[PDB]
Symmetry: D2
Subunit: 295 residues, 4 copies
């Protein structure tokens, strides 16, 4: 046998960092879950039980804290690159680092129409993630995204003209409920090193806000008959507003709402134009994926 591939590291490392302003007295908090996986000349740890090439995962957890203490944790795209570079630079035998970061929401509270200096609320289970691959000699690869974004539109969505055969029973519709969770991922053009990443810092937070805004707006305004076409319009706008992006990827898990026919009960009308009460379905669910690039 032979080791064709190997990674290892620490997962689920929860980190919280606070920023205090001595002047204004305002405080800002950052909470995220980090995962670091290493690659390199560690083959013997598997084949010869040689631990000498092993940087303890516990030490990888230590490095994460230490790094967050000496560096800025925002934007996550930067912090990830810093954390990733450290490993391939500090350890001669390590040649790849894979960093995953999940950012939780801690939105500043508004008390009496005013932003509180030190109170926060988790206003959503929506996440801002980044997957940064740092490979020796090959620069830095970044993949930004947002997930856990749940949306619904009560009308202005249709579905007809689809293939029909001996396996179809679905009835075409010109009005229906469209609900889904949004997983959007934008891949940045390869970066040569930390210095290049550092120089584009301003673009990160901006592009994210751009991705979020485009998604919501397009979703809300688009009177579709093809979820596929809807997400394609979403990817176009993103690619157009940010030149540094190489590809945009969407993954929309459809959430179905069934009509309930109650006519059997005193001629109760609750279908088609009279549909008012629906039964949300936990499963199954449609899944539509999409990767869009430049011509």
């Amino acid at each position: 046998s032979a080791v064709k591939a190997a990674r290892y590291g620490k997962d689920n490392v929860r980190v919280y960092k606070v920023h205090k302003d001595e002047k204004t007295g305002v405080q800002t908090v950052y909470e995220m879950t980090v995962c670091v996986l290493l690659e390199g000349e560690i083959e013997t740890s598997y084949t010869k039980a040689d631990n000498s090439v092993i940087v303890a995962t516990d030490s990888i957890k230590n490095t994460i804290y230490i790094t967050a203490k000496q560096n800025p944790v925002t934007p996550p795209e930067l912090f990830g690159s810093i954390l990733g570079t450290h490993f391939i630079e500090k350890y001669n035998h390590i040649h790849a680092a894979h960093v995953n970061i999940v950012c939780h929401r801690w939105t500043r509270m508004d008390i009496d129409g005013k932003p509180h200096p030190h109170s926060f609320i988790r206003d959503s289970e929506e996440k801002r993630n980044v997957q940064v691959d740092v490979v020796e000699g090959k620069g830095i690869d970044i993949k930004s995204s947002l997930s856990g974004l749940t949306v619904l539109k009560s009308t202005n969505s249709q579905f007809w003209g689809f293939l029909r055969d001996e396996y179809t029973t679905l009835k075409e519709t010109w009005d229906r409920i469209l609900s889904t969770d949004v997983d959007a991922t934008w891949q940045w053009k390869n970066f040569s090193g930390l210095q290049e990443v550092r120089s584009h810092v301003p673009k990160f937070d901006a592009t994210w806000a751009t991705a979020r805004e485009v998604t919501l707006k397009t979703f809300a305004e688009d009177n579709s008959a093809s979820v596929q076409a809807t997400m394609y319009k979403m990817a176009e706008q993103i690619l157009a507003r940010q030149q540094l992006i190489e590809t945009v990827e969407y993954s929309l898990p459809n959430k179905h709402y069934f009509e309930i026919d109650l006519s059997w009960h005193k001629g109760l009308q609750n279908t088609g134009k009279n549909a008012e009460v629906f039964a949300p379905q936990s499963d199954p669910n449609g899944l539509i994926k999409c990767t869009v690039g430049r011509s």
Copy 2:
């Protein structure tokens, strides 16, 4: 042996309702999970295997759907009362109905700084619930609540002066993080019947908004060395602002954030006054409860 208590019904009944305004064309959606358990002279289903006294759980389901279609599903406190009343009025042997409703958040999307007519977002995992108890010849008991409200304050929270013995290792503190999930419940005075509940409708949504605002404010502004003291303050205000309320119950699971001593590494200062990076703890967690009533 003998049956001392029995209940049965349908759980996890997902429901969705949409209200359309022909005039403006603005739509509104409601989604919730309903549970209905029944009580009465049904012992024989257990003892003699007699089903004749059993109202099918599938029919309880049908009923929930029908009820929603024929009535207003908001406020929940009202809808719950109607649904519970239905069973004791339609069945001779049914003497009590216990309805549990969980309302999910579908916040209206703001596009271009203007509310969208038919697009929604799940802006939180926070819920608004109700527990209605309809008992023949004893009125309707209603318990309202809000849960899943997660907050954190980076300062202005202390803890000192607590009991100290041979089992204590916790050091006193005058500045720490305070994070928790909020579970607040207010119990209304017993209503005589559907009519009376219908007469106080406007107080349900208002009392809920009030309970929410007081919790958020008190938490944010109170600088106490006692989570206990803070929650009592919240209950006080709620009881003072709504006379129709008998008791207010709070249950706060204290989520801890530990200081990370990094001194062992090049004398890095990250404790006490220099504490910037913390480690969130998934478990365990303090749990503080409290039921406040009137003198």
Copy 3:
């Protein structure tokens, strides 16, 4: 206002203990999640923010570990009584201690047809729990239970004879799938103190086994048209076999499996006597409860 009720303590405290047999060298492991809530003269901590009467929840945690170290953690009924007793006896202003324990399975591995001395496998997600209420001058109250026991019988289950009205659409059946999670609890007669509990120790593990065996046996053998009737028989046998038990309580959340009509496709027969493929339903579900006592 006035404090009607108050509790507080530590929750989700994970504990693991290993017992090494000094003769054979065989190791047995125990793992469980503990929760401890205290009651007593602590009102002032809420009304006057007086922390002097507060035993830190951190100390509560510490006490759990220490107690586990100096005492046997099995059976959980004993360990819960020891832990509960400690708090009311060590603190004068503490009058009640509510201990909840969840036991996780760590089944010994059989390797090559022989029990391994120190390797375990988490076979089920089924738990064994205990709730122990230790109240000063009122003895020790113990509620044992098993939960998370999932079973299914493809046949020998019926449902017909139930009530039928204008809300009924369900067809009666004489063959159907019965699946459900099992939640069984057995209340022990009130115990005077730790001394009494200790003397009845051998009865705890035994009865749990009995409850589990009866539940499984009855469910599999009973050919009934009433779940309610099946659970009652379960309760009966448990009360007959153990006199120290006062009441048995079952809570069965049904899991439905619908037939799938496939006649629209080449007249495929998949209903009634030809039903082979079914569609498991996540929700909603029927919930049947029952508390049985002695005449």
Copy 4:
């Protein structure tokens, strides 16, 4: 801009099938969750909102049910093949079918020392899965695995001799607790088509049982200084017991049990040789992976 990649289908389709032996009266049940994703000339559905090329997800669901009714659902490897094949063979514009199947346990109950004819128990949250990729003109690729296998050994596990530096605080140990959730996947050699998969049907259940056995036994008996070394040995044996296997992948999440120092309480000894009470840690956790293949050395 342009469409680089595109898939779509039905996810989380729960299925239950029962087999009744009219002779013996013994019934056997099967439950699984299926996911089917399709690929092909469907770019227009994105670029020009053309649903004409779209096979409704609802119809994909119906198809799973029909296929389940007309064919065996065991072993999963076979069923996934039968299902993926159907799509590329029935739709000219559909070129690839990605089928994911999760198998839920329903173990027959033993009552009074004998197996019950129609009663089962969910004796574990452990699962048996398969990922089948049917591509037009490329054959059938199969990835079988087992997951959710949680194990723990209270001793006979060590960790010393690792790299130490200014970021290191961990102390060396010669006796510790080793617990982990096992995730094992074995890739089969490419199959030309359905007929070839059918011929090998018997190897599927046999290899699954071998992988599970090898995993448990090795975990139990190995006294290794590294989880890496222990998972390598497991892969070795599996590759050695089945020649149709090309690679074996292992993903082990080391769950930690920390010692608790109680000496601050009357000098109570609870560390090292005296350790009895441990604190299980929910997070974070170590994560070790590795893909083992066949050597080129003769």
